[PDB]
Amino acid sequence: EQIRQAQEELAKIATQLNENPEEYPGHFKALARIGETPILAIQKLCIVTQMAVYKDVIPGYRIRPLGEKEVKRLRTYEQALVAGYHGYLKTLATYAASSIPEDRKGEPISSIAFTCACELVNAVPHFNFRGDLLRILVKKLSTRKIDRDFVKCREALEKLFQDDEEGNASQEAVSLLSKMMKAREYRVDESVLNLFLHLRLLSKWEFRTKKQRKLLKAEKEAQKVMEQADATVSHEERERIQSEILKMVFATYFRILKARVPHLMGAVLEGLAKYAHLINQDFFGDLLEALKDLIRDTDRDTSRESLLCTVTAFALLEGQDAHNARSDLHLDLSFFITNLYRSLLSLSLNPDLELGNNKINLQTTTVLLLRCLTSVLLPPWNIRSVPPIRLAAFCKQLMTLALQVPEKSSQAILGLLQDVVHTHGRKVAALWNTEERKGDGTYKPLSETVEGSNPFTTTIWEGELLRKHYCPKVREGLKAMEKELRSI
Amino acid sequence: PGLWEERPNIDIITAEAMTLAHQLATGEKTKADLIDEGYNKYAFKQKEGLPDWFLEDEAKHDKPIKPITKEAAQAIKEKLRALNARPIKKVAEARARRKLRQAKKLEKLK
Amino acid sequence: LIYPLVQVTLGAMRLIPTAIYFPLRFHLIRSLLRLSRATDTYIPLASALLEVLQSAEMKKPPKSSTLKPLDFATAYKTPKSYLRTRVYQDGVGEQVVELLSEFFVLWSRNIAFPEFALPTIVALKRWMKEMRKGNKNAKLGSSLVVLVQKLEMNAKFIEERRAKVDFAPKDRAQVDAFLKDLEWEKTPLGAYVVAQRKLREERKRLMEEARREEERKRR
Amino acid sequence: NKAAEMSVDDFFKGGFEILS
Amino acid sequence: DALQNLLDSIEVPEGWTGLTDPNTGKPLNLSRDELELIRKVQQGLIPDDV
RNA sequence: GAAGCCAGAGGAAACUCUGGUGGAGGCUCGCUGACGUGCAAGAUCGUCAAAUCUGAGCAUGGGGGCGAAAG
């Protein structure tokens, strides 16, 4: 039919453009004209064929507008190519913005256009009108309606972020995403924020005549000096692009934090924990007191926010560079430790503990609590330097919490104390041997400070209740913990 | 199978401009004084009909000289400082490099 | 087989925690507590009780009405009339006071009672300060203040009689022989709970024989 | 070790131990 | 707010000067008209209107 | 004295062994300190010099502290 006639036309066009590109300059316009037809089958076919032809003809460089025989051949061919590519992008925009719903005969033109756009992003980022291409991608990743096309465009942007080695495409994509989120007032679905996490820039004797030999020598020295200059300018340009992208990313993170979007704080804190070592130093301190201010605002849902910020601070300080910076930078986590200590009881009586590769963005408050307690009691660095008073106070309060929390959370806490006693031992054995109980002072449960509560003046009595707890799992947890206590 | 987008932004990146900004911010000279000093010999000079070579020749040889203040210079440097200018890793490795330089100096002295 | 059985009861009250469905939660918590008393198994329920306390109905000032006290032996749901009524507020406060009473008298001798109760005391004191910074229900206020005082007294009592017990981790004869020789009326919380058992009984036969006279008068 | 094995987010599903 | 200070450090305000107002402890900023006047003084094209 | 090449004896092949050809080697012969990392009360790993000889011609780098370098 007309469909087969169109297929023959497109086949001729594509074959001619693959074989001899220069000799055929107007067949881009021929594709546009044949795609102008109003029947859906030929529109799908022409869009796919245009995808293929631009994919295999776009050069590895951009071209300048001429403005103002072989040379004129190339100029005409390149001008036709860019005009055609602009036309293809406009048509892709219109079809992608066109209404998806139709009668069911396969993938609609909307999904086909989205696939074409994703392939263009993945294949030709360097070429012109990357702005229009990425604008279509962002207009799709700005709707809060998870779809197959939505996940395709997320995958395309993630692939671009993890494959960009120069940085300009990544910069422009980040700028578009940032402006989109600011315009939508941060009503996005946290996937566009995880894209920032996925960013990569933030991580045979051929005879030669006498004449030829001297030339190839000359271009040898020329390419040597060019490689040197190229390396230096590449370093400088990468640094500048990284600076700009970091500026935009941290700006959007800080604005989301200041707006307190309930469903994005985890992702924002993960990004902060990931990139605070790549941002400056006084700014690292500023983020520490920013987390302090978030804790205080939550003090004046809320429990999860406070635990998220505590995990963020502890991970930030658990980074290697921050750990070596500690003394010089005055990075003290005493506030976070005391806040966790004072909030343990409220979290223990909270009824929503279990109402739920990431290291910060964790969906369950008890998981957050184990991350906090692991960072405090069992830090990766200076594990044999932890204050015994801190260890004992947290052990006592954690036994009380294990008494007063749901079964699986209790089993988690009990295993954490099992590991704590295995690791430290003699520092806390006095908490179970009553004849080593200290006699200087009385235990103060409702204390404001960990040291204020004298932890070595009390004994762990919670076993006589947790042993008759109804959960066999927590029962063998106590059995193993007491076994380690006896095998010290 | 089956073959949200909807006035100029003045930015001071220049030491002389930030010096005048400081002078306006402080009660040193006022708005009326700025207009009065703006009617100087450089005022009423054409720019619209002129070729680029002529304009650049004047731009390179006709910049009025004004004192710069250390405060304005520091403010410009702070504003144009990169966000990744002083990472912990780079500060630590610069300190390590200077410590190595001192150790090598001592060994040469030995 | 108690474990599976409990799991289901926890899930049953956690399916939806709504003030409409408080009575069902109260009934299943009573079931769990009576199971705990007959067996020797610990059932965490202070979380559920503190939830119903820091739920919506028991904080905002109530609404004036004139209805009949809900019979918390025949309810699966609460009528739309009882949404903000002082009658409903008093009924739920009395039920909470009761359930806490049986819980904390039911575990009134374990050598870790203060370690088991202290979170409940601090939560109740926080709620009391919040509501006297709420409603105006002085009846519930006084009932909870006397409850928390008696809980603190029982915890202290455990302090003095446990201060002289040896509990090395390889020798626990004294803690295994701690308090078998004392009965559930000597403890201050035992006296508390038996006294309000007597008070609950007097109110119950009050209402029962009373409704009998109204029935006879109507007849 | 064991603490990490429980701090895995997949350990708090809520499956009843009668569907073994 | 610490977050607001962080935003300011990332993207400095338009009228940022690095000084502190003696009248009020907050940092002092240039207004739209003041920035326009600084522009006019620096370029010289139209020092005064009309 | 290794790659590589040649014969033969076993192994389905891959390979093992013997007898050889081959003459590449950061291989031999003639007459330590300074540091860095350490995650404890010091273990370990890494970096820095000792740089074919010689006649006649020729060029360059030099101090300190500050700073991320640019300066």
PDB file of N, CA and C in Angstrom, chain C residues 127-201:
ATOM      1  N   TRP C 127       2.805  13.718  79.257  1.00  0.00           N
ATOM      2  CA  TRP C 127       1.441  13.955  78.797  1.00  0.00           C
ATOM      3  C   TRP C 127       0.727  14.877  79.778  1.00  0.00           C
ATOM      4  N   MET C 128       0.944  14.651  81.076  1.00  0.00           N
ATOM      5  CA  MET C 128       0.299  15.449  82.112  1.00  0.00           C
ATOM      6  C   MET C 128       0.724  16.907  82.021  1.00  0.00           C
ATOM      7  N   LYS C 129       2.018  17.153  81.801  1.00  0.00           N
ATOM      8  CA  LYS C 129       2.474  18.530  81.620  1.00  0.00           C
ATOM      9  C   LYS C 129       1.881  19.159  80.364  1.00  0.00           C
ATOM     10  N   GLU C 130       1.833  18.404  79.265  1.00  0.00           N
ATOM     11  CA  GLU C 130       1.216  18.900  78.039  1.00  0.00           C
ATOM     12  C   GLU C 130      -0.234  19.306  78.262  1.00  0.00           C
ATOM     13  N   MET C 131      -0.997  18.478  78.964  1.00  0.00           N
ATOM     14  CA  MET C 131      -2.415  18.741  79.158  1.00  0.00           C
ATOM     15  C   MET C 131      -2.678  19.720  80.291  1.00  0.00           C
ATOM     16  N   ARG C 132      -1.690  19.966  81.153  1.00  0.00           N
ATOM     17  CA  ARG C 132      -1.684  21.134  82.019  1.00  0.00           C
ATOM     18  C   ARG C 132      -0.411  21.908  81.669  1.00  0.00           C
ATOM     19  N   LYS C 133      -0.470  22.599  80.535  1.00  0.00           N
ATOM     20  CA  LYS C 133       0.546  23.535  80.067  1.00  0.00           C
ATOM     21  C   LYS C 133       0.317  24.931  80.633  1.00  0.00           C
ATOM     22  N   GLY C 134      -4.960  21.979  76.583  1.00  0.00           N
ATOM     23  CA  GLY C 134      -5.579  20.701  76.292  1.00  0.00           C
ATOM     24  C   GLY C 134      -7.033  20.648  76.710  1.00  0.00           C
ATOM     25  N   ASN C 135      -7.462  19.491  77.203  1.00  0.00           N
ATOM     26  CA  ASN C 135      -8.816  19.354  77.700  1.00  0.00           C
ATOM     27  C   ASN C 135      -8.927  19.962  79.092  1.00  0.00           C
ATOM     28  N   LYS C 136     -10.064  19.699  79.723  1.00  0.00           N
ATOM     29  CA  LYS C 136     -10.297  20.079  81.102  1.00  0.00           C
ATOM     30  C   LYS C 136     -10.659  18.895  81.986  1.00  0.00           C
ATOM     31  N   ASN C 137     -10.325  17.668  81.579  1.00  0.00           N
ATOM     32  CA  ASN C 137     -10.791  16.472  82.269  1.00  0.00           C
ATOM     33  C   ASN C 137      -9.958  16.193  83.517  1.00  0.00           C
ATOM     34  N   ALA C 138     -10.280  16.905  84.596  1.00  0.00           N
ATOM     35  CA  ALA C 138      -9.605  16.728  85.872  1.00  0.00           C
ATOM     36  C   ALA C 138      -9.770  15.327  86.440  1.00  0.00           C
ATOM     37  N   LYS C 139     -10.847  14.619  86.098  1.00  0.00           N
ATOM     38  CA  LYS C 139     -11.005  13.244  86.563  1.00  0.00           C
ATOM     39  C   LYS C 139      -9.879  12.362  86.036  1.00  0.00           C
ATOM     40  N   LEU C 140      -9.659  12.392  84.719  1.00  0.00           N
ATOM     41  CA  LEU C 140      -8.552  11.647  84.131  1.00  0.00           C
ATOM     42  C   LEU C 140      -7.212  12.165  84.630  1.00  0.00           C
ATOM     43  N   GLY C 141      -7.093  13.480  84.814  1.00  0.00           N
ATOM     44  CA  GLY C 141      -5.853  14.019  85.343  1.00  0.00           C
ATOM     45  C   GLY C 141      -5.490  13.458  86.706  1.00  0.00           C
ATOM     46  N   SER C 142      -6.456  13.463  87.627  1.00  0.00           N
ATOM     47  CA  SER C 142      -6.216  12.938  88.967  1.00  0.00           C
ATOM     48  C   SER C 142      -5.978  11.435  88.938  1.00  0.00           C
ATOM     49  N   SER C 143      -6.741  10.710  88.116  1.00  0.00           N
ATOM     50  CA  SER C 143      -6.548   9.268  88.041  1.00  0.00           C
ATOM     51  C   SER C 143      -5.147   8.926  87.561  1.00  0.00           C
ATOM     52  N   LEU C 144      -4.667   9.605  86.523  1.00  0.00           N
ATOM     53  CA  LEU C 144      -3.318   9.334  86.054  1.00  0.00           C
ATOM     54  C   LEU C 144      -2.243   9.817  87.014  1.00  0.00           C
ATOM     55  N   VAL C 145      -2.465  10.917  87.741  1.00  0.00           N
ATOM     56  CA  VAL C 145      -1.428  11.340  88.678  1.00  0.00           C
ATOM     57  C   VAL C 145      -1.309  10.348  89.830  1.00  0.00           C
ATOM     58  N   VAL C 146      -2.432   9.840  90.345  1.00  0.00           N
ATOM     59  CA  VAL C 146      -2.307   8.839  91.400  1.00  0.00           C
ATOM     60  C   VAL C 146      -1.716   7.546  90.841  1.00  0.00           C
ATOM     61  N   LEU C 147      -2.052   7.192  89.596  1.00  0.00           N
ATOM     62  CA  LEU C 147      -1.458   6.010  88.979  1.00  0.00           C
ATOM     63  C   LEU C 147       0.059   6.137  88.904  1.00  0.00           C
ATOM     64  N   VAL C 148       0.550   7.285  88.436  1.00  0.00           N
ATOM     65  CA  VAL C 148       1.990   7.443  88.248  1.00  0.00           C
ATOM     66  C   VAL C 148       2.698   7.507  89.597  1.00  0.00           C
ATOM     67  N   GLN C 149       2.061   8.125  90.598  1.00  0.00           N
ATOM     68  CA  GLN C 149       2.640   8.117  91.939  1.00  0.00           C
ATOM     69  C   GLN C 149       2.795   6.695  92.461  1.00  0.00           C
ATOM     70  N   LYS C 150       1.771   5.861  92.275  1.00  0.00           N
ATOM     71  CA  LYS C 150       1.868   4.494  92.777  1.00  0.00           C
ATOM     72  C   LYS C 150       2.885   3.674  91.989  1.00  0.00           C
ATOM     73  N   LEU C 151       2.995   3.912  90.681  1.00  0.00           N
ATOM     74  CA  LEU C 151       4.031   3.237  89.901  1.00  0.00           C
ATOM     75  C   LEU C 151       5.423   3.607  90.399  1.00  0.00           C
ATOM     76  N   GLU C 152       5.651   4.897  90.663  1.00  0.00           N
ATOM     77  CA  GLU C 152       6.938   5.328  91.195  1.00  0.00           C
ATOM     78  C   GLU C 152       7.205   4.706  92.561  1.00  0.00           C
ATOM     79  N   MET C 153       6.178   4.638  93.410  1.00  0.00           N
ATOM     80  CA  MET C 153       6.348   4.023  94.722  1.00  0.00           C
ATOM     81  C   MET C 153       6.722   2.551  94.598  1.00  0.00           C
ATOM     82  N   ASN C 154       6.075   1.829  93.680  1.00  0.00           N
ATOM     83  CA  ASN C 154       6.400   0.418  93.494  1.00  0.00           C
ATOM     84  C   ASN C 154       7.818   0.239  92.969  1.00  0.00           C
ATOM     85  N   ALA C 155       8.237   1.097  92.035  1.00  0.00           N
ATOM     86  CA  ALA C 155       9.607   1.029  91.540  1.00  0.00           C
ATOM     87  C   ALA C 155      10.605   1.267  92.663  1.00  0.00           C
ATOM     88  N   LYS C 156      10.334   2.253  93.522  1.00  0.00           N
ATOM     89  CA  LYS C 156      11.219   2.498  94.658  1.00  0.00           C
ATOM     90  C   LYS C 156      11.272   1.292  95.585  1.00  0.00           C
ATOM     91  N   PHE C 157      10.107   0.726  95.895  1.00  0.00           N
ATOM     92  CA  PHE C 157      10.007  -0.461  96.738  1.00  0.00           C
ATOM     93  C   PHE C 157      10.886  -1.586  96.202  1.00  0.00           C
ATOM     94  N   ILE C 158      10.834  -1.798  94.886  1.00  0.00           N
ATOM     95  CA  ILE C 158      11.740  -2.749  94.256  1.00  0.00           C
ATOM     96  C   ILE C 158      13.194  -2.324  94.444  1.00  0.00           C
ATOM     97  N   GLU C 159      13.492  -1.019  94.381  1.00  0.00           N
ATOM     98  CA  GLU C 159      14.868  -0.588  94.640  1.00  0.00           C
ATOM     99  C   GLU C 159      15.353  -1.050  96.007  1.00  0.00           C
ATOM    100  N   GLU C 160      14.603  -0.739  97.071  1.00  0.00           N
ATOM    101  CA  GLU C 160      15.135  -1.101  98.384  1.00  0.00           C
ATOM    102  C   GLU C 160      15.212  -2.609  98.566  1.00  0.00           C
ATOM    103  N   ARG C 161      14.256  -3.379  98.043  1.00  0.00           N
ATOM    104  CA  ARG C 161      14.423  -4.802  98.325  1.00  0.00           C
ATOM    105  C   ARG C 161      15.354  -5.505  97.332  1.00  0.00           C
ATOM    106  N   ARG C 162      15.805  -4.839  96.272  1.00  0.00           N
ATOM    107  CA  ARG C 162      16.769  -5.459  95.378  1.00  0.00           C
ATOM    108  C   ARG C 162      18.183  -4.934  95.545  1.00  0.00           C
ATOM    109  N   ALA C 163      18.387  -3.882  96.339  1.00  0.00           N
ATOM    110  CA  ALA C 163      19.721  -3.315  96.488  1.00  0.00           C
ATOM    111  C   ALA C 163      20.722  -4.300  97.079  1.00  0.00           C
ATOM    112  N   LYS C 164      20.257  -5.371  97.723  1.00  0.00           N
ATOM    113  CA  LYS C 164      21.153  -6.292  98.411  1.00  0.00           C
ATOM    114  C   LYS C 164      21.081  -7.702  97.834  1.00  0.00           C
ATOM    115  N   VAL C 165      21.054  -7.822  96.511  1.00  0.00           N
ATOM    116  CA  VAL C 165      20.964  -9.117  95.845  1.00  0.00           C
ATOM    117  C   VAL C 165      22.165  -9.284  94.926  1.00  0.00           C
ATOM    118  N   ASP C 166      22.830 -10.431  95.028  1.00  0.00           N
ATOM    119  CA  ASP C 166      23.992 -10.730  94.203  1.00  0.00           C
ATOM    120  C   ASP C 166      23.554 -11.384  92.898  1.00  0.00           C
ATOM    121  N   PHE C 167      24.010 -10.823  91.775  1.00  0.00           N
ATOM    122  CA  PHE C 167      23.622 -11.280  90.445  1.00  0.00           C
ATOM    123  C   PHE C 167      24.825 -11.410  89.513  1.00  0.00           C
ATOM    124  N   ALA C 168      25.866 -12.112  89.936  1.00  0.00           N
ATOM    125  CA  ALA C 168      26.974 -12.424  89.045  1.00  0.00           C
ATOM    126  C   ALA C 168      26.444 -13.270  87.892  1.00  0.00           C
ATOM    127  N   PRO C 169      27.050 -13.214  86.703  1.00  0.00           N
ATOM    128  CA  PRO C 169      26.472 -13.928  85.557  1.00  0.00           C
ATOM    129  C   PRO C 169      26.668 -15.434  85.593  1.00  0.00           C
ATOM    130  N   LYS C 170      27.339 -15.972  86.609  1.00  0.00           N
ATOM    131  CA  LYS C 170      27.497 -17.412  86.772  1.00  0.00           C
ATOM    132  C   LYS C 170      26.918 -17.885  88.102  1.00  0.00           C
ATOM    133  N   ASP C 171      26.179 -17.013  88.784  1.00  0.00           N
ATOM    134  CA  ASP C 171      25.563 -17.350  90.062  1.00  0.00           C
ATOM    135  C   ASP C 171      24.334 -16.482  90.289  1.00  0.00           C
ATOM    136  N   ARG C 172      23.141 -17.057  90.135  1.00  0.00           N
ATOM    137  CA  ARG C 172      21.895 -16.290  90.152  1.00  0.00           C
ATOM    138  C   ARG C 172      20.858 -16.963  91.048  1.00  0.00           C
ATOM    139  N   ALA C 173      21.327 -17.638  92.087  1.00  0.00           N
ATOM    140  CA  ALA C 173      20.437 -18.255  93.060  1.00  0.00           C
ATOM    141  C   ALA C 173      19.556 -17.249  93.778  1.00  0.00           C
ATOM    142  N   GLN C 174      20.113 -16.117  94.209  1.00  0.00           N
ATOM    143  CA  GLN C 174      19.301 -15.127  94.904  1.00  0.00           C
ATOM    144  C   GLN C 174      18.235 -14.516  94.008  1.00  0.00           C
ATOM    145  N   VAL C 175      18.551 -14.230  92.745  1.00  0.00           N
ATOM    146  CA  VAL C 175      17.540 -13.642  91.875  1.00  0.00           C
ATOM    147  C   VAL C 175      16.522 -14.694  91.450  1.00  0.00           C
ATOM    148  N   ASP C 176      16.903 -15.974  91.472  1.00  0.00           N
ATOM    149  CA  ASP C 176      15.930 -17.021  91.187  1.00  0.00           C
ATOM    150  C   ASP C 176      15.117 -17.339  92.435  1.00  0.00           C
ATOM    151  N   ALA C 177      15.552 -16.820  93.579  1.00  0.00           N
ATOM    152  CA  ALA C 177      14.793 -16.978  94.813  1.00  0.00           C
ATOM    153  C   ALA C 177      14.389 -15.622  95.372  1.00  0.00           C
ATOM    154  N   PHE C 178      14.223 -14.640  94.488  1.00  0.00           N
ATOM    155  CA  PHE C 178      14.021 -13.251  94.885  1.00  0.00           C
ATOM    156  C   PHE C 178      12.758 -13.014  95.712  1.00  0.00           C
ATOM    157  N   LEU C 179      11.574 -13.200  95.127  1.00  0.00           N
ATOM    158  CA  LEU C 179      10.333 -12.835  95.816  1.00  0.00           C
ATOM    159  C   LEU C 179       9.207 -13.830  95.562  1.00  0.00           C
ATOM    160  N   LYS C 180       9.458 -15.127  95.739  1.00  0.00           N
ATOM    161  CA  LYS C 180       8.342 -16.068  95.676  1.00  0.00           C
ATOM    162  C   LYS C 180       7.445 -15.966  96.906  1.00  0.00           C
ATOM    163  N   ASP C 181       7.979 -15.455  98.014  1.00  0.00           N
ATOM    164  CA  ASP C 181       7.270 -15.492  99.293  1.00  0.00           C
ATOM    165  C   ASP C 181       6.422 -14.249  99.553  1.00  0.00           C
ATOM    166  N   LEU C 182       6.010 -13.514  98.532  1.00  0.00           N
ATOM    167  CA  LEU C 182       5.210 -12.316  98.734  1.00  0.00           C
ATOM    168  C   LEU C 182       4.028 -12.322  97.757  1.00  0.00           C
ATOM    169  N   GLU C 183       2.847 -11.922  98.243  1.00  0.00           N
ATOM    170  CA  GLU C 183       1.615 -12.086  97.482  1.00  0.00           C
ATOM    171  C   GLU C 183       1.135 -10.735  96.973  1.00  0.00           C
ATOM    172  N   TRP C 184       0.284 -10.770  95.937  1.00  0.00           N
ATOM    173  CA  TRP C 184       0.064  -9.595  95.093  1.00  0.00           C
ATOM    174  C   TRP C 184      -0.724  -8.487  95.775  1.00  0.00           C
ATOM    175  N   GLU C 185      -0.882  -8.540  97.095  1.00  0.00           N
ATOM    176  CA  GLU C 185      -1.539  -7.472  97.832  1.00  0.00           C
ATOM    177  C   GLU C 185      -0.590  -6.677  98.716  1.00  0.00           C
ATOM    178  N   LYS C 186       0.637  -7.158  98.929  1.00  0.00           N
ATOM    179  CA  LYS C 186       1.577  -6.425  99.771  1.00  0.00           C
ATOM    180  C   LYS C 186       2.163  -5.227  99.036  1.00  0.00           C
ATOM    181  N   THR C 187       2.360  -5.350  97.728  1.00  0.00           N
ATOM    182  CA  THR C 187       2.982  -4.277  96.969  1.00  0.00           C
ATOM    183  C   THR C 187       2.067  -3.055  96.945  1.00  0.00           C
ATOM    184  N   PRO C 188       2.626  -1.843  96.918  1.00  0.00           N
ATOM    185  CA  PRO C 188       1.775  -0.647  96.839  1.00  0.00           C
ATOM    186  C   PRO C 188       0.872  -0.648  95.626  1.00  0.00           C
ATOM    187  N   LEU C 189       1.379  -1.106  94.483  1.00  0.00           N
ATOM    188  CA  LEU C 189       0.540  -1.235  93.305  1.00  0.00           C
ATOM    189  C   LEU C 189      -0.483  -2.349  93.449  1.00  0.00           C
ATOM    190  N   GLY C 190      -0.170  -3.395  94.215  1.00  0.00           N
ATOM    191  CA  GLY C 190      -1.183  -4.386  94.530  1.00  0.00           C
ATOM    192  C   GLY C 190      -2.332  -3.801  95.327  1.00  0.00           C
ATOM    193  N   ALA C 191      -2.014  -2.993  96.340  1.00  0.00           N
ATOM    194  CA  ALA C 191      -3.058  -2.316  97.104  1.00  0.00           C
ATOM    195  C   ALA C 191      -3.870  -1.387  96.209  1.00  0.00           C
ATOM    196  N   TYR C 192      -3.178  -0.635  95.353  1.00  0.00           N
ATOM    197  CA  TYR C 192      -3.833   0.236  94.380  1.00  0.00           C
ATOM    198  C   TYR C 192      -4.826  -0.536  93.517  1.00  0.00           C
ATOM    199  N   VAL C 193      -4.376  -1.647  92.932  1.00  0.00           N
ATOM    200  CA  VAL C 193      -5.201  -2.368  91.973  1.00  0.00           C
ATOM    201  C   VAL C 193      -6.377  -3.036  92.673  1.00  0.00           C
ATOM    202  N   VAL C 194      -6.170  -3.579  93.877  1.00  0.00           N
ATOM    203  CA  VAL C 194      -7.285  -4.221  94.569  1.00  0.00           C
ATOM    204  C   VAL C 194      -8.302  -3.179  95.023  1.00  0.00           C
ATOM    205  N   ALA C 195      -7.826  -2.003  95.446  1.00  0.00           N
ATOM    206  CA  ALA C 195      -8.749  -0.949  95.844  1.00  0.00           C
ATOM    207  C   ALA C 195      -9.633  -0.529  94.679  1.00  0.00           C
ATOM    208  N   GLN C 196      -9.049  -0.360  93.494  1.00  0.00           N
ATOM    209  CA  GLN C 196      -9.922   0.031  92.391  1.00  0.00           C
ATOM    210  C   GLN C 196     -10.648  -1.148  91.756  1.00  0.00           C
ATOM    211  N   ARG C 197     -10.235  -2.385  92.030  1.00  0.00           N
ATOM    212  CA  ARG C 197     -11.137  -3.496  91.756  1.00  0.00           C
ATOM    213  C   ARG C 197     -12.396  -3.388  92.599  1.00  0.00           C
ATOM    214  N   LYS C 198     -12.244  -3.071  93.885  1.00  0.00           N
ATOM    215  CA  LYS C 198     -13.409  -2.872  94.742  1.00  0.00           C
ATOM    216  C   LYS C 198     -14.268  -1.714  94.245  1.00  0.00           C
ATOM    217  N   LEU C 199     -13.629  -0.611  93.853  1.00  0.00           N
ATOM    218  CA  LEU C 199     -14.362   0.532  93.312  1.00  0.00           C
ATOM    219  C   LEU C 199     -15.085   0.203  92.006  1.00  0.00           C
ATOM    220  N   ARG C 200     -14.445  -0.528  91.096  1.00  0.00           N
ATOM    221  CA  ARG C 200     -15.103  -0.970  89.876  1.00  0.00           C
ATOM    222  C   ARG C 200     -16.298  -1.861  90.198  1.00  0.00           C
ATOM    223  N   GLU C 201     -16.140  -2.779  91.155  1.00  0.00           N
ATOM    224  CA  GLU C 201     -17.260  -3.626  91.556  1.00  0.00           C
ATOM    225  C   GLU C 201     -18.418  -2.819  92.117  1.00  0.00           C
TER     226      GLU C 201
END
